[PDB]
Design a protein around this ligand. Sequence first.
Ligand SMILES: [Ca+2]
Ligand SMILES: [Ca+2]
Ligand SMILES: [Fe+2]
Ligand SMILES: [Fe+2]
Ligand SMILES: [Fe+3]
Ligand SMILES: [Fe+3]
Lengths: 125, 125
Amino acid sequence: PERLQVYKCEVCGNIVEVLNGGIGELVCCNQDMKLMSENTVDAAKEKHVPVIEKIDGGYKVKVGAVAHPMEEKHYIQWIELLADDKCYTQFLKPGQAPEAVFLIEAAKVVAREYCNIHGHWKAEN
Amino acid sequence: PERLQVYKCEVCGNIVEVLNGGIGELVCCNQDMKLMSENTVDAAKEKHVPVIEKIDGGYKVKVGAVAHPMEEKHYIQWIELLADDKCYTQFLKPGQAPEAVFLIEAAKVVAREYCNIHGHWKAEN
Ligand SMILES: [Ca+2]
Ligand SMILES: [Ca+2]
Ligand SMILES: [Fe+2]
Ligand SMILES: [Fe+2]
Ligand SMILES: [Fe+3]
Ligand SMILES: [Fe+3]
């Protein structure tokens, strides 16, 4: 695995992000954890692809063009901003607006979000 | 596993951080991944415990009271700041200063750092 990749155990639900890569295959509940590749699930793009808005001193990210649901059983678990060697994560809770604000200096950034039902999604400016 | 925990495979070097918990144990290279509990390694505290400094708009974190080495074989791989539901990480590289600046509004924060040789360390304000 490589740094920044997100893996999930489909049996018990553990989800982890790689901080340091290696050659070993991550395992949980007797099976290889699944790589959650971005933008691969068949889901509404207008509700899952992050929309990046440049603000003074940082970025505002919303999921998505159409506000994604934030219900107990279906919500955006976190929004992450990747810039240079920075990885900022904003965890969310059902009931909150599917958005996040990050104060950072970087012209080029990548925004990612994870939906408990529809998986991993990303956008970039 | 629980959110925020850091695990390492002592065989291949994979290191991951938990985003979503679960009941199954993380395994790699045929053995349980090691839980990297903070401040448990027998190393120089003055070089590993993060020192949190309040600055205008956020916090500056340095590792540690005495600058930790940043050599090819021994360096601080990243500095993380935890506040509310925010998890901000700054990955570093040999040759860089063992410090990181985070712009954030949070009265209570926890700063963590990981040394490739001496493990996981933390401090809080
Ligand atoms: Ca075991
Ligand atoms: Ca992270
Ligand atoms: Fe969804
Ligand atoms: Fe060290
Ligand atoms: Fe599992
Ligand atoms: Fe391994």
